[PDB]
Motif scaffolding. Structure first.
Motif, mmCIF file in Angstrom:
data_model
loop_
_atom_site.group_PDB
_atom_site.id
_atom_site.type_symbol
_atom_site.label_atom_id
_atom_site.label_comp_id
_atom_site.label_asym_id
_atom_site.label_seq_id
_atom_site.Cartn_x
_atom_site.Cartn_y
_atom_site.Cartn_z
ATOM 1 N N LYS A 161 45.390 57.113 38.741
ATOM 2 C CA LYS A 161 44.146 57.525 39.367
ATOM 3 C C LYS A 161 44.447 58.439 40.554
ATOM 4 C CE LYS A 161 41.125 55.722 41.686
ATOM 5 N NZ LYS A 161 40.767 54.687 42.704
ATOM 6 N N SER A 162 45.507 58.102 41.288
ATOM 7 C CA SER A 162 45.819 58.747 42.566
ATOM 8 C C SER A 162 46.454 60.126 42.373
ATOM 9 C CB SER A 162 46.714 57.838 43.419
ATOM 10 O OG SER A 162 47.674 58.571 44.156
ATOM 11 N N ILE A 163 47.280 60.242 41.332
ATOM 12 C CA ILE A 163 47.907 61.513 40.986
ATOM 13 C C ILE A 163 46.921 62.463 40.297
ATOM 14 C CG2 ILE A 163 49.865 62.649 39.842
ATOM 15 C CD1 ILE A 163 51.200 59.790 39.893
ATOM 16 N N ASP A 164 45.953 61.904 39.567
ATOM 17 C CA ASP A 164 44.908 62.701 38.923
ATOM 18 C C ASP A 164 43.871 63.175 39.950
ATOM 19 O OD1 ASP A 164 43.339 63.995 37.081
ATOM 20 O OD2 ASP A 164 42.388 62.182 36.294
ATOM 21 N N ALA A 165 44.316 64.054 40.847
ATOM 22 C CA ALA A 165 43.528 64.485 42.006
ATOM 23 C C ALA A 165 42.114 64.929 41.654
ATOM 24 C CB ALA A 165 44.250 65.593 42.753
ATOM 25 N N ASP A 166 42.000 65.875 40.735
ATOM 26 C CA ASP A 166 40.691 66.376 40.361
ATOM 27 C C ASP A 166 39.970 65.344 39.483
ATOM 28 O OD1 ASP A 166 41.484 66.417 37.793
ATOM 29 O OD2 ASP A 166 40.852 68.491 37.399
ATOM 30 N N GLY A 167 40.574 64.167 39.350
ATOM 31 C CA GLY A 167 40.017 63.090 38.545
ATOM 32 C C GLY A 167 39.392 63.485 37.213
ATOM 33 N N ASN A 168 39.998 64.437 36.507
ATOM 34 C CA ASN A 168 39.479 64.875 35.205
ATOM 35 C C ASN A 168 40.135 64.193 33.994
ATOM 36 O OD1 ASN A 168 41.914 66.169 34.604
ATOM 37 N ND2 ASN A 168 40.980 68.167 34.203
ATOM 38 N N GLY A 169 40.985 63.196 34.241
ATOM 39 C CA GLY A 169 41.504 62.369 33.165
ATOM 40 C C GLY A 169 42.871 62.724 32.608
ATOM 41 N N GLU A 170 43.387 63.889 32.995
ATOM 42 C CA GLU A 170 44.724 64.312 32.603
ATOM 43 C C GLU A 170 45.433 64.753 33.864
ATOM 44 O OE1 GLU A 170 45.407 64.098 28.750
ATOM 45 O OE2 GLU A 170 44.616 66.082 28.226
ATOM 46 N N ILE A 171 46.761 64.746 33.868
ATOM 47 C CA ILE A 171 47.526 65.239 35.018
ATOM 48 C C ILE A 171 48.138 66.602 34.679
ATOM 49 C CG2 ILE A 171 49.621 64.843 36.361
ATOM 50 C CD1 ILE A 171 48.965 61.899 36.348
ATOM 51 N N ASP A 172 47.769 67.653 35.406
ATOM 52 C CA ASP A 172 48.300 68.982 35.090
ATOM 53 C C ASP A 172 49.542 69.266 35.938
ATOM 54 O OD1 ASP A 172 47.386 70.455 37.625
ATOM 55 O OD2 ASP A 172 45.451 69.815 36.831
ATOM 56 N N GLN A 173 50.177 70.409 35.721
ATOM 57 C CA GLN A 173 51.436 70.691 36.403
ATOM 58 C C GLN A 173 51.263 70.768 37.910
ATOM 59 O OE1 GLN A 173 52.971 74.232 34.030
ATOM 60 N NE2 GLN A 173 54.317 72.576 33.336
ATOM 61 N N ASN A 174 50.084 71.197 38.349
ATOM 62 C CA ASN A 174 49.809 71.306 39.781
ATOM 63 C C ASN A 174 49.724 69.959 40.471
ATOM 64 O OD1 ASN A 174 49.871 73.809 41.093
ATOM 65 N ND2 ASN A 174 47.980 74.475 40.055
ATOM 66 N N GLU A 175 48.997 69.031 39.850
ATOM 67 C CA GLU A 175 48.925 67.651 40.323
ATOM 68 C C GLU A 175 50.250 66.934 40.200
ATOM 69 O OE1 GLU A 175 45.992 66.603 37.587
ATOM 70 O OE2 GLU A 175 44.327 66.861 38.977
ATOM 71 N N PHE A 176 50.958 67.148 39.099
ATOM 72 C CA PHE A 176 52.265 66.526 38.976
ATOM 73 C C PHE A 176 53.210 67.016 40.065
ATOM 74 C CE2 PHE A 176 56.622 66.197 37.438
ATOM 75 C CZ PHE A 176 56.675 64.842 37.273
ATOM 76 N N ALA A 177 53.186 68.329 40.304
ATOM 77 C CA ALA A 177 54.066 68.976 41.271
ATOM 78 C C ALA A 177 53.791 68.434 42.673
ATOM 79 C CB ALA A 177 53.879 70.502 41.224
ATOM 80 N N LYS A 178 52.519 68.344 43.024
ATOM 81 C CA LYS A 178 52.141 67.763 44.298
ATOM 82 C C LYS A 178 52.718 66.358 44.449
ATOM 83 C CE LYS A 178 49.152 69.922 45.903
ATOM 84 N NZ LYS A 178 48.074 70.770 46.516
ATOM 85 N N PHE A 179 52.772 65.610 43.349
ATOM 86 C CA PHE A 179 53.301 64.251 43.372
ATOM 87 C C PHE A 179 54.831 64.176 43.378
ATOM 88 C CE2 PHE A 179 55.260 60.841 40.952
ATOM 89 C CZ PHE A 179 54.896 59.733 41.701
ATOM 90 N N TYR A 180 55.443 64.767 42.363
ATOM 91 C CA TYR A 180 56.890 64.743 42.277
ATOM 92 C C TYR A 180 57.533 65.294 43.557
ATOM 93 C CZ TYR A 180 61.548 64.976 40.435
ATOM 94 O OH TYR A 180 62.897 64.736 40.238
ATOM 95 N N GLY A 181 56.897 66.314 44.133
ATOM 96 C CA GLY A 181 57.391 66.967 45.333
ATOM 97 C C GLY A 181 57.202 66.145 46.594
ATOM 98 N N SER A 182 56.832 64.880 46.422
ATOM 99 C CA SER A 182 56.720 63.928 47.522
ATOM 100 C C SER A 182 57.629 62.730 47.245
ATOM 101 C CB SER A 182 55.272 63.453 47.691
ATOM 102 O OG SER A 182 54.408 64.556 47.863
ATOM 103 N N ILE A 183 58.912 63.006 46.975
ATOM 104 C CA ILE A 183 59.904 61.918 46.813
ATOM 105 C C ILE A 183 61.339 62.456 46.581
ATOM 106 N N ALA A 237 49.330 68.792 29.405
ATOM 107 C CA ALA A 237 48.628 67.853 30.271
ATOM 108 C C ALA A 237 49.324 66.521 30.171
ATOM 109 C CB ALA A 237 47.160 67.732 29.862
ATOM 110 N N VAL A 238 49.421 65.787 31.272
ATOM 111 C CA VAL A 238 49.999 64.451 31.187
ATOM 112 C C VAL A 238 48.872 63.423 31.179
ATOM 113 C CG1 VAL A 238 51.352 62.675 32.334
ATOM 114 C CG2 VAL A 238 52.307 64.958 32.035
ATOM 115 N N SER A 239 48.818 62.643 30.105
ATOM 116 C CA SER A 239 47.805 61.605 29.931
ATOM 117 C C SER A 239 48.258 60.251 30.501
ATOM 118 C CB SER A 239 47.505 61.430 28.446
ATOM 119 O OG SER A 239 48.594 60.764 27.796
ATOM 120 N N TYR A 240 47.318 59.317 30.604
ATOM 121 C CA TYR A 240 47.650 57.939 30.946
ATOM 122 C C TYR A 240 48.646 57.291 29.961
ATOM 123 C CZ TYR A 240 47.588 53.068 32.003
ATOM 124 O OH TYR A 240 47.981 51.788 32.302
ATOM 125 N N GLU A 241 48.482 57.522 28.664
ATOM 126 C CA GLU A 241 49.425 56.935 27.714
ATOM 127 C C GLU A 241 50.851 57.356 28.042
ATOM 128 O OE1 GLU A 241 48.320 54.437 26.429
ATOM 129 O OE2 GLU A 241 47.535 54.679 24.386
#
Ligand SMILES: [Ca+2]
Ligand SMILES: [Ca+2]
Ligand SMILES: [Ca+2]
Ligand SMILES: [Ca+2]
Ligand SMILES: [Ca+2]
Ligand SMILES: [Ca+2]
Lengths: 64, 64, 64
Positions: free
Chosen positions: B42-64, A15-19
């Motif tokens: 906040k914006s990358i943490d789509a499901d707003g659960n406090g951590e960024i998972d590979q799916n959310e990261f992928a959605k982000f990284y894959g937009s640049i 998981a990627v955290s804010y830190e």
């Protein structure tokens, strides 16, 4: 695959955290800095021998 | 009243010094940073659960 | 002559290294900062007595 994600995911919990985000962006800022500076240094180090001597410095300072 | 003045007046002597000014502006810079970053995170943490998972990261990284 | 070169040449070996370049530019950044801030502080310190009182702060804060 997932190389970048692993690199930001510093503690490897999947998981990627804010830190870790914060820390990654710091890291990236510093590298771009390291690399502008190294390019500039590269350019003033005319004879490309790894140090800047008074002649190379003079050629540079004397252009501003 | 005087809340901001008290906040910069770190030693509470009723006068704002150069040190305290310097320190306040550092503090403010860091907070605006904390807050841009937290908004981006906040914006990358789509499901707003406090951590960024590979799916959310992928959605982000894959937009640049 | 060579005053600037001597100043960047921190270890005095007659050559300017990448470290010393890096360090000089940091130093310069901080000084320009010290000097913008000191000028701004100068401007808010109306009676120029070295501290900013509530009256001077109020005159300033109340202009933004
Ligand atoms: Ca993690
Ligand atoms: Ca050289
Ligand atoms: Ca004070
Ligand atoms: Ca999430
Ligand atoms: Ca040297
Ligand atoms: Ca004053």
């Amino acid at each position: 695959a997932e190389a970048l994600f692993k690199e930001i995911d510093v503690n490897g919990d999947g998981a990627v955290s804010y830190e870790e985000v914060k820390a990654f962006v710091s890291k990236k800022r510093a590298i771009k800095n390291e690399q502008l500076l190294q390019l500039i240094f590269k350019s003033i180090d005319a004879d490309g021998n790894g140090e800047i001597d008074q002649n190379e410095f003079a050629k540079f300072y004397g252009s501003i």
